[PDB]
Paper text:
The Saccharomyces cerevisiae Yta7 (yeast Tat [transactivator of transcription]-binding analog 7) is a chromatin-associated AAA+ (ATPases associated with various cellular activities) ATPase that maintains the balance of nucleosome density of the chromatin. Yta7 is type II ATPase containing two ATPase domains (AAA1 and AAA2), which is conserved in eukaryotes and expected to assemble a 910 kDa hexamer. The AAA1 is an active ATPase, whereas the AAA2 has no ATPase activity because of a lack of nucleotide-binding motif. By cryo-EM analysis, here we show that Yta7 assembles a three-tiered hexamer with a top BRD tier, a middle AAA1 tier, and a bottom AAA2 tier.
To understand how Yta7 interacts with the H3 tail, we next performed cryo-EM on the Yta7–H3 N-tail (1–24 amino acids) complex in the presence of 2 mM ATPγS. We derived two 3D maps, one without H3 N-tail density at an estimated resolution of 5.6 Å and the other with a clear H3 N-tail density at 3.0 Å overall resolution. Accordingly, the 3.0 Å map with bound H3-tail was termed state II. But further 3D classification and focused refinement revealed at a low resolution (9.7 Å) that the BRD tier is in a flat-ring configuration, in which the H3 peptide now could thread into the AAA+ chamber from the center of the ring. In the ATPγS-bound state II where the BRD–BIM tier is largely disordered and forms a flat ring, the substrate entry is open, and there is a linear and continuous density with side-chain features in the Yta7 AAA1 chamber. The density best fits with the C-terminal 15 residues (Lys10–Lys24) of the added H3 tail, but the best is not perfect for every side chain, indicating that a small population of the H3 peptides in the Yta7 may be out of register. The modeled H3 peptide is oriented with its N terminus pointing downward, suggesting that the N terminus of H3 first threads into the Yta7 central chamber, and that the unresolved N-terminal nine residues may have reached the AAA2 chamber and become disordered. The modeled H3 peptide (Lys10–Lys24) is stabilized by PL1 and PL2 of the Yta7 AAA1 α/β subdomain. Specifically, six PL1 (one from each of the six subunits) surround the peptide like a right-handed staircase with six Trp492 contacting the peptide backbone. However, in the ATPγS-bound Yta7 state II, five ATPγS molecules were identified in the AAA1 domains of subunits B–F. The EM density in the nucleotide-binding pocket of the lowest subunit A is consistent with an ADP, suggesting the ATPγS in this site has been hydrolyzed.
Author numbering:
A (entry chain G): 10 to 24
B (entry chain C): 401 to 735, 756 to 940, 1318 to 1378
C (entry chain B): 407 to 735, 756 to 939, 1318 to 1378
D (entry chain D): 531 to 719
E (entry chain A): 397 to 530
F (entry chain F): 531 to 624
Amino acid sequence: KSTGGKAPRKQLASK
Amino acid sequence: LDPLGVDMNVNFDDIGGLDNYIDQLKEMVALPLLYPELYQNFNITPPRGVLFHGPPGTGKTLMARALAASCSSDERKITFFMRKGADILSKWVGEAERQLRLLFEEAKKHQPSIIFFDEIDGLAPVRSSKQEQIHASIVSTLLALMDGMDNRGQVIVIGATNRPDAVDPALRRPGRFDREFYFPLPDVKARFKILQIQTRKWSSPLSTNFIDKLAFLTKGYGGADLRSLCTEAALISIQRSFPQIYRSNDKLLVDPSKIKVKVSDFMLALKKIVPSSARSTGSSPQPLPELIKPLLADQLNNLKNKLDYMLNIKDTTFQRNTSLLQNFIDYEEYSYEFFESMAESQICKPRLLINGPKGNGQQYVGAAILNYLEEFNVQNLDLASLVSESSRTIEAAVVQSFMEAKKRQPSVVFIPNLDIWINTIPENVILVLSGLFRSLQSNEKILLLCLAENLDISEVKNGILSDFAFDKNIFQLHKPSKENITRYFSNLIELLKTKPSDIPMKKRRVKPLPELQKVTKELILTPEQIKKVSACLIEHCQNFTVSQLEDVHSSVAKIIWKSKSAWDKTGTVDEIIKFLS
Amino acid sequence: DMNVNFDDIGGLDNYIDQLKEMVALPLLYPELYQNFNITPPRGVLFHGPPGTGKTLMARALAASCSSDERKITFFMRKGADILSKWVGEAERQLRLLFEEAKKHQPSIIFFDEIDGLAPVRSSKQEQIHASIVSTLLALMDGMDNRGQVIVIGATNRPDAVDPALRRPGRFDREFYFPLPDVKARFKILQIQTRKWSSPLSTNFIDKLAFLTKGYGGADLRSLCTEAALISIQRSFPQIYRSNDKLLVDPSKIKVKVSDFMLALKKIVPSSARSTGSSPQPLPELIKPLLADQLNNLKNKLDYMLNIKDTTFQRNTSLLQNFIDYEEYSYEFFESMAESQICKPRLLINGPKGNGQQYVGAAILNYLEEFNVQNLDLASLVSESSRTIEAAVVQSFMEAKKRQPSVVFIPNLDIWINTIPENVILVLSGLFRSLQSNEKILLLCLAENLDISEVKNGILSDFAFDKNIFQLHKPSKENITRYFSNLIELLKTKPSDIPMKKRRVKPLPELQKVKELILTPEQIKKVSACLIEHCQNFTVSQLEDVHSSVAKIIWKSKSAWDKTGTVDEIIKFLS
Amino acid sequence: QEQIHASIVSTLLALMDGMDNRGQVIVIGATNRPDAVDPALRRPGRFDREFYFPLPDVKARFKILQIQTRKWSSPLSTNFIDKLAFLTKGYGGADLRSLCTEAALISIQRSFPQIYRSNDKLLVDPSKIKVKVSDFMLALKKIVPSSARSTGSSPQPLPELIKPLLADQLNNLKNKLDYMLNIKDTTFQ
Amino acid sequence: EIADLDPLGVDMNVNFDDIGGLDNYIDQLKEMVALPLLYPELYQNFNITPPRGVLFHGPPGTGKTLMARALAASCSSDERKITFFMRKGADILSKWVGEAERQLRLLFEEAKKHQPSIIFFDEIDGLAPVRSSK
Amino acid sequence: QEQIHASIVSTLLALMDGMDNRGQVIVIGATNRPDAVDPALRRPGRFDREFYFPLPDVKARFKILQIQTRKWSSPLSTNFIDKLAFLTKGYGGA
Ligand SMILES: Nc1ncnc2c1ncn2[C@@H]1O[C@H](COP(=O)(O)OP(=O)(O)OP(O)(O)=S)[C@@H](O)[C@H]1O
Ligand SMILES: Nc1ncnc2c1ncn2[C@@H]1O[C@H](COP(=O)(O)OP(=O)(O)OP(O)(O)=S)[C@@H](O)[C@H]1O
Ligand SMILES: Nc1ncnc2c1ncn2[C@@H]1O[C@H](COP(=O)(O)OP(=O)(O)O)[C@@H](O)[C@H]1O
Ligand SMILES: [Mg+2]
């Protein structure tokens, strides 16, 4: 089993 | 830049043996562009999908390269998109199909496009719920892109594999990959033509009779292996021409005008090249070797005549066309197609059992027959092929090998050592194979060729081998007759009477190498003795088989090879008579 | 990684010349290659046993042609270390690898253990593996030129690589790296010891070359390392018992022969840790018992296998015959040379326990050039996922692929008892499909085997007709020469026997930073009773007597009156 | 497998028959593998009906070949389209489309062979090309239908040569199977 | 950087003075790690490289892990530490194909980076079993 | 894995290795899936002594049922609590 992942959380962090 | 690399400006005449497929390709990429109204005269859509498949080095990537060179010419702009095996998978998983769609969108943009999917079995395997959902979702995206509801445009999709059954079966459908082009290991005419293509800008050319002998000696060679043969012959010619450049790191002064590739350079290359269709298994079947040709050539000729009578190899008044387009050009039309039925009616049940004594050269006869059948697809049902898989059963191996013979005809089911193969294959496996053979139509060109030592007729008439119709096809290998034995041993008596000055013992250089600059009596052998050693050599081998004669010949060749320097061959002759008698 | 060149490699000089015409000759003389319009081979598969110099050859190739003008950029991958969880990133990493190998156009990629990266493609396996093999096949020979990139792959078994990766264009040539012979083991020991301060003489380094049969190059490197470490332990032991740095001088440590003997005791080669027989020479004790019989066997093998001719097939390297010899100004003579081999078979039979385990190993030691394939039971039933018939077929295949070769079956009387008869028929059909000139020796050793399974039994298809050699029981003179070493140990005075003597002092600190009475009529009596006891004995029955009498003699190794020892030896043999 | 896939399936379940009414939205799904569709998606309220599109039978293959060769200026005989429908068991609609395509291409290649050897346009007369029986027979010999690419071929009818030897008993076996199995669709079509 | 790449932080309360009954392997382990760091002038005189690999094998609770941890805290002195990586063959991600090769390559990168290193594999037959198994 | 959890592990490991030998802080941690914690914290010098908390056996379920029953106004006889103990093979305290 080998499958990949989402490009990581953007962490907007401005508000 | 690589100046010695593969050249991209290959034209379609640097491909040998694939002339039907070049014409069939040029009515997919060129003829809908030049003549759109002919396809409009019917309601036909041109075939825009082709899967190249066959063994590696057969030129599948070479045909795509020649095609991409053809589309990189004036008067017709055809964009070429080259894709390797699963390079369209993005770094993430949500974007992979988004990449693939983007390819087709871009392919639809430049409106005459070709997409070449090299190694497409690694991009689009058979959809499986136990594999990975991304490898089924990419296949579903590709399936809905080659023909969904909307038109994909004038985009020709070409795939290339050597395992086409590992492609999803929905993809190989008219409207995605309509045509499937099979690229075979080339036959003698095509091995000749590839050997001419490789050696055509050479300085001093190969003669055409030598290219014939090279095409005969190479078998199981693909085009890649023939190019490797010419490369190794050229490299051996360089390293016997100028051996100094191998022992010096600095560049010496060398002219490549004194370098001529000779015949023995090709023979030394043939001693060392293992073709790719023999690297995994052992080797290739070879012709009857030159030493035993007197013993078995007269029986092998009767076998070859019987085999091309039975299989209709020699005529081919319908088949073996180099290109059907040249058949439309060079042959008039007739202007009631059961003459095809009468022509295909000349194959009823190709069976051949070659029976003989316990040592009569059946391995040589089998290999020489497998060389005579060049178009045929050999499936080897020997014990060493069935049991050489711990994973697969030898019930499934027999069935998969017969279905591989049946799928790609003409084909041979080759069972050597049938007298062994009866005893160590279980009875129902012989019943299972018989069932597959009766499932076929009489005109199926699947030959069952068997070789056996001391197998009786009681097994063939009323036994386990009775369900294969071997009743009239029972060729008996005789032991070699006295004329064959006399010609066998005359090549050895010729070794007895050679001059020691004429044996090719090549001698050391007494002088050093012509260094390159850097750049900045008689034989005492009475003819009565020759006739005496020939008489005892014959009448010793009275009713011998082939391997017994090879035993006697090996012993006497040892005795003759001891006194290979002596100018007195008189001790040798009495030593031979002391041995045999 | 260390700097290496081609002179740190011993006994692979044929392959270095083939590598020169694929990496260095196309750079120097591009016009010689485009005279014939032939692309230089740029793919080679190095395969063979471990420790035989595959990675060393791959590194020496990079550091040899690299110079002032052209740099050969070396890229090394480990065996499937390119793999991420998403196969698309592994695609991008192989693609970026070949792209940066093309950016530095003179380059080499080494795939170490490429069978782990690129197995044979199958649907009954994960799609990551078939995907990476597909992109590897299209990056090595695809529709565009890959540049001047040389791809080298190492593997222990080449048949587990995908077969589309073994074809000209990608991995064109395959070099088998064999376990070194005496000459190359000599050269490897000279290579390892040449930077030592005090060097080894030639007689001891040839004694080492003969004592290290079965050693690969990694074995010989670890042997020289362990000998130097034992010499360090012997010279300055104090460094192994202090917390911090002491003061030592490099002038004092010199590696002696006894250090190499102690290293030979503890170093085990990868031939000795496999499961088949080990081709050792005849051991020095039983050599008087079986040397005469063994010598006859060497003559029989010289006759049937043409080991003493070597007048046409002297091709060490194809270049080296062009260097010293001269090209001939019929070549059917080579067919009459190949025609001296007919069907090399040899069954060595004898009584029970008559030293067949020594004779088979000594014969395989005599056939140094040959590829020994083992068909003993423990070599077939060793792999658990591999069946017996498949194992036998694989063993025959590797014998057929690499000739001259031996198909070796020790304990043939056990072998025809446990092996099912339809594997003996498969092996007989495999040998029955061979051309006569093919140098595959079938060498079986049996123990009280009858002749009846040979004439009309199970082994009738193998044709041991006139090729049956009988190991007979050793003669009275062989027994006398055998027991002479025992009585020579009895005659040894206790001064001569090596006592591990204690020290008279401690070791200096390293600062911080009579008449051995034995009458020769009594010796004649113990000789006469040793001969009279061992009447019609086999080799193992003689070794039992030699072991019990050697136990009795080693009891009294320090006594100077050897009377009661003699009386105990005559009391035992009764 | 991953959670993106089961999350998309769960969202499609909640959007097709969930708490809120989806409206007058028809949802159609085409698939080659219906047992690779989630089984909670195959129930009334979301994919109520399941239309099984088979490989066409003899009458449907005749009608598909009639649609394909319809706007051909030289038409084809109804006896020949019945003969072509008899010979194409295992052909889909795509395979019969390719059969008429390759037959027309063999007729074009036979009429004007010179064009396949040129590089510019050569003034082909489009009205003198005619798809014959021989071109359809060559295209039948050429073509593997997609149902038989991976496997072997379909079971073919009795060959034209041995049909005197076996046709009169094959008709008896056909009569026996019609009586045994109600093959003629007796009043239920 | 996101993997199992952390050094196991050893304690200096474990040395060979707390191991019982295994003095030959300690003396063989001094020439493997400690003496090439302490006397690099002597290993270079014979141009030898010490053995970079050793397999500890035996029944559970006999001190293989203790021997490795004491080896780490033996020549971790004179402002020259031994960076200790300890992995295990019983991890859930150890048989994770595609990921486990990335983790192993990153472990060997980070062990080459902290130059005197020790990688200890607690159950190596969980990680490297026999390929001819059933 | 995310970055922020990976850095949480990277600091919790360094904090656990920073804790001195004279052990005065003890970190207890609970999970219902032990091979889903990161492998690093299970290494020596970290979370290394374990307590397995199985499902209860019959006498343990008897005691648990007694504990739940304790403060009822109308009581439950001990034979019925024993029968309910023997009927619940597989029942945790919840
Ligand atoms: N029919 C041919 N005529 C001339 N040269 C050929 C032919 N087939 C192969 N060659 C030569 O061999 C080389 C290898 O051919 P390829 O087309 O790369 O093989 P391939 O079909 O792609 O095999 P695989 O599956 O990719 S390993 C070509 O670049 C040519 O030099
Ligand atoms: N033929 C040889 N000549 C000289 N030194 C050798 C030879 N073979 C091995 N060695 C030495 O022993 C070491 C063993 O490593 P290698 O021989 O490269 O291992 P390998 O089996 O060839 O390849 P692997 O298994 O992928 S590391 C080399 O680094 C050399 O130092
Ligand atoms: N031979 C030994 N000498 C001293 N202490 C030991 C020995 N074996 C085990 N111990 C003690 O037991 C503890 C755990 O043993 P461990 O090294 O985990 O065994 P294993 O390596 O077999 O897993 C060690 O920390 C050590 O304190
Ligand atoms: Mg290719």
